[PDB]
Structure formats: C-alpha cells, structure tokens
C-alpha cells in the first residue's frame with residue numbers, strides 16, 4: 798500500500814484506489830495501473846523531472862529501502878493477476894529486487910524526488926509505474 802501527495806493530488810495504484818478516490822477522480826489509466834484523486838490538504842512530495850536510472854525504493858515486505866538500477870519506462874508484458882488479465886502495461890520500469898503484491902504503492906526516489914510507485918513483480922523483479930511524464934502534477 799502507499800501514495801504520492803503532490804499539491805492537491807493523491808497518486809495511487811489504480812488497483813488499490815478507494816471510493817473517495819474514484820469520486821474525486823482527476824485522471825486514471827488502466828494500462829499504467831495509475832489513479833490521481835483531488836485532496837483537501839496540500840501535499841509535500843516533489844516529483845522528479847529527470848531520466849535517472851538509479852534510485853532507492855521502499856519494500857514493505859522487508860521493511861527495507863533498497864538501492865536499484867531500473868529500466869527506462871516502456872511497454873512490458875505483465876502476467877495475469879487478481880487485478881488485471883495478462884496485458885502490456887505502459888510507462889513501466891523494471892529492477893532486480895524483492896517485492897510481493899502487498900508492496901504496491903512503495904515509492905521509488907532519485908536525487909530529484911519521486912520517480913514512481915511499485916506496481917508489478919515476480920521472479921526476483923520489481924516493476925514501478927513512472928509518474929515523471931505527468932507534468933501537470935506540479936501545477
């Protein structure tokens with residue numbers, strides 16, 4: 798579980814969004830596993846604006862932050878789950894690292910700020926949904 802809080806926006810995994818989220822929906826892309834909802838209070842996270850391929854992510858299933866190298870955001874085939882059938886997920890970055898389903902929402906961060914959230918994994922890989930192209934999150 799987990800979210801990004803930037804300005805009056807809340808970014809979550811689409812597959813974990815709540816009632817208030819859909820109600821206050823700003824934007825969602827099923828192919829990216831992303832949903833942005835409006836917030837009352839102002840958030841304090843900074844979104845990275847960069848092409849970094851190294852960073853640190855939070856793994857709730859280890860209570861540990863791991864340094865990782867990750868691929869640039871791309872179209873990647875993701876095995877069927879309880880949330881989606883087998884499909885190409887867009888804007889997805891892979892690293893070698895441990896993850897389990899319930900780690901989704903864990904932040905990936907570089908020196909420039911928030912890069913993305915845990916979205917996919919299995920076979921010793923962890924996938925992260927990029928948010929760095931979502932320029933409107935900053936205004």
Ligand SMILES: Cn1nc(C(=O)NC2CC2)c2cc(F)ccc21
Pocket residue numbers: 812830875878879880881896897898899900901915916917918919923924
């Ligand atoms: C981080 N992580 N996410 C998922 C997942 O099913 N994500 C759905 C596409 C949303 C997963 C499955 C695993 F077996 C191991 C790790 C995982």
Ligand SMILES: [Zn+2]
Pocket residue numbers: 845846847848849907908909910
């Ligand atoms: Zn960066």
